[PDB]
Design a protein around this ligand. Structure first.
Ligand code: HEM
Ligand code: HEM
Ligand code: HEM
Ligand code: HEM
Ligand code: HEM
Ligand code: HEM
Ligand code: HEM
Ligand code: HEM
Lengths: 110, 110
C-alpha cells in the first residue's frame, strides 16, 4: 500500500523563527532510483518508518551550522558521499563526467 | 509516515481455489535489513509503491509451476540470487558459512 512521492519540495520555511537565505529545493526520486532506499533514509532500522530528514530530533538544527544536526552541514558536506547531496554529487565527478548539480542555484530554485 | 512491517506471514491460502501443500512462511525484514529495499521489491520504479509479491498480475500463478508468474518458481528458483528466497540463501553458502535456511520446514512453519 506504501506510495512513494516522486517529487518532494524541501523547504527552510519549516522553521518559523528563521529567515531563509536560499530558495526551496526540489528532490526527485526518479533520478536517484538506482540508490538503495536505506542509503539515504539511513535511520530506517531505528524507527521502521521513512521520515523527513529535518524531523524533530534529526537534522532540524537551523541556528548552528557545523553540527551534525545542522541543516547546512547535512546537505552540503563533502565529508560524506553516501547521503549528503553535494557530498555525493561531487564524488560522482571523480568517477567520470557527471551532471549531478553542485551550483547553489541548480539545486535551490523556487 | 511510511511504516514497515517487521514480520510478515506469507500464505498460499490467499488462493481460494487451491489446497496448500506446505505451511505458511514468516518473513522478517530485520534479518534482511542490509539488502537494498528495491532489490527484493524490484517493481518499485514501475508503480512507485511497495506491494505484495503475490499481487494480481505479478507472481500470483498457483496452477502453473515453471512460469515466472508462478508462486513456486519465484521463491525457490536458484536461477536468481538477488530476490529468490532459496536462490539467495544458496548463494550465501558459496560465499562462506551461512545459516540462511534451505530446508523446506525451516521456512514453512506455522
Ligand atoms: C527507495 C525506492 C526509496 C523509498 C522507498 C523512499 C521513500 C521516501 C518517502 C516515503 C519519502 C517521504 C517521507 C515522509 O513521509 O516525509 C521520501 C522522501 C525523500 N527521500 Fe526517499 N525513498 C527512497 C530512496 C531515496 C534515495 C536513494 C534518496 C537519496 C538520494 C532519497 C531521499 C529522500 C529525500 C531527501 C526526501 C525528502 C525528505 C524531506 O525531508 O522532505 N530517497 N522518500
Ligand atoms: C534524509 C534522507 C537524511 C539525510 C540526507 C541525512 C544525512 C545525514 C548525513 C550527511 C549524516 C552525517 C554522517 C557523517 O557525518 O559522516 C547523517 C548522520 C546522522 N543522521 Fe541523518 N540524514 C537523514 C535522515 C535522518 C533522520 C530522519 C534522522 C533522525 C531519526 C537522522 C539522524 C542522524 C544521526 C543521529 C546521525 C549521526 C549518527 C548516525 O546514526 O549515523 N538522519 N545523516
Ligand atoms: C540531497 C537530499 C540531494 C538532492 C536535493 C539532490 C538533487 C539532485 C538534483 C537536483 C539532480 C538533478 C536532476 C533532478 O533534479 O532530479 C540530481 C541528480 C543526481 N543525483 Fe542527487 N540529490 C541529492 C542526493 C544525492 C545523493 C546522496 C546521491 C549519491 C549517492 C545523488 C546522486 C545523483 C545522481 C546519480 C544524479 C544523476 C545525474 C546524471 O548525471 O544523470 N544525489 N540530484
Ligand atoms: C551553494 C554553495 C549553496 C548555497 C550557498 C546553499 C545554501 C543553503 C542554505 C543557507 C541552506 C539553508 C536554508 C536557507 O534557505 O538559507 C541550504 C539548505 C539546503 N540546501 Fe543548499 N546551498 C547551496 C548548494 C546546494 C546544492 C548544490 C544542493 C543540491 C545538491 C543543495 C541542497 C540543499 C538542501 C536539500 C537543503 C535543505 C532544505 C532547504 O532548506 O531548502 N544546496 N542550502
Ligand atoms: C527496505 C528497508 C525495505 C522496505 C522499505 C520494505 C517495505 C515493505 C513493505 C511496506 C511491505 C508490505 C507491503 C504491502 O503493503 O503488502 C514489505 C513486505 C515484504 N518485503 Fe519488504 N521492504 C524492504 C526490504 C525488503 C527486502 C530486502 C526484502 C527481500 C529479502 C523484502 C521482502 C519483502 C517480502 C517478501 C515481503 C512480503 C511480501 C508479500 O507478498 O506479503 N523487503 N516490505
Ligand atoms: C516480492 C518482494 C517479489 C519477489 C520475491 C519477486 C521475485 C522475482 C523473481 C525471482 C523474478 C525472476 C527473475 C528471473 O527469472 O531472473 C521476478 C521477476 C519479475 N517480477 Fe517479481 N518479485 C516480487 C514482486 C513483484 C511484483 C509486485 C510484481 C508485479 C508488479 C513483479 C513482477 C515481476 C515481473 C514482471 C518479472 C519479470 C520481468 C522483470 O521485470 O524482471 N514482481 N520477480
Ligand atoms: C524470500 C521472500 C525470503 C524468505 C521467506 C527468507 C527467509 C529467511 C529466513 C526464514 C531466515 C532466517 C532468519 C529469519 O527468520 O528472519 C533468513 C535469513 C537470511 N536471509 Fe532470507 N529470505 C528470503 C529472501 C532473501 C534474499 C533474496 C536474500 C539475499 C539477497 C536473503 C538473505 C538472507 C540473509 C543474509 C539471512 C541472514 C542469516 C544469517 O546467517 O545471519 N533472504 N531468510
Ligand atoms: C523444500 C524443497 C520446500 C518445499 C517442498 C516447499 C514447497 C512450497 C510450495 C509447494 C509452495 C506453494 C504453497 C503450498 O503451500 O503448497 C511454496 C511457497 C513458498 N515457499 Fe517453499 N518450499 C520449500 C522450501 C522453501 C524455503 C527454504 C523457503 C524460504 C527460503 C520457502 C519459501 C516459500 C515462500 C516465500 C512461498 C510463498 C508463500 C507461501 O505460499 O507460503 N520455501 N513452497
Amino acid at each position: 500500500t506504501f506510495e512513494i512521492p516522486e517529487s518532494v519540495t524541501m523547504s527552510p520555511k519549516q522553521f518559523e523563527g528563521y529567515t531563509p537565505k536560499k530558495g526551496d529545493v526540489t528532490f526527485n526520486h526518479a533520478s536517484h532510483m538506482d540508490i538503495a532506499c536505506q542509503q539515504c533514509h539511513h535511520t530506517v532500522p531505528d524507527t521502521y518508518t521513512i521520515e523527513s530528514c529535518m524531523t524533530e530530533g534529526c537534522h532540524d538544527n537551523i541556528k548552528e551550522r557545523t553540527e551534525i544536526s545542522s541543516v547546512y552541514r547535512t546537505f552540503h558536506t563533502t565529508k560524506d558521499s553516501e547521503k549528503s547531496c553535494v557530498g555525493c554529487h561531487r564524488e560522482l565527478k571523480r568517477q567520470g563526467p557527471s551532471d549531478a548539480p553542485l551550483a547553489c542555484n541548480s539545486c535551490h530554485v523556487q
